[PDB]
């Protein structure tokens, strides 16, 4: 079957309100479902919003994951989203750095 692995882009923190920053990853243009997303190899679970995917007019899916972290952690704590797309045997670990 035809598959297409995702293009993963950072959603950089800049996105900060009352001492909390939101950052994330955009998992673009993959096929078929599903993708899974973890953060810091499963170390970061609290305040994570992931999925569901959107089906674009192209017939490809996109999905995002956003985590809210303390703003003081930025540039200290590394944030890596771990994206797995089993159907294409692709994994992407994207480092999300402040802009």
């Amino acid at each position: 079957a035809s598959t297409k692995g995702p293009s993963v882009f950072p959603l950089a923190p800049s996105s900060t309100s009352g001492g909390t920053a939101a950052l994330g990853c955009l998992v673009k243009d993959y096929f078929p479902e599903p993708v899974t997303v973890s953060w810091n190899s499963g170390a970061l679970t609290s305040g994570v919003h992931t999925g569901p995917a959107v089906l674009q007019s192209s017939g490809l899916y996109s999905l995002s994951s956003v985590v809210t972290v303390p703003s003081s952690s930025l540039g200290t704590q590394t944030y890596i989203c771990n994206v797995n797309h089993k159907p294409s045997n692709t994994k992407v670990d994207k480092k999300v750095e402040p802009k």
Partner: peptide
């Protein structure tokens, strides 16, 4: 992202 724009694409994400 800068990376996406360099790939000749653009997506705004509203969470």
């Amino acid at each position: 992202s800068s990376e996406e724009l360099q790939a000749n694409k653009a997506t705004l994400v509203c969470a």
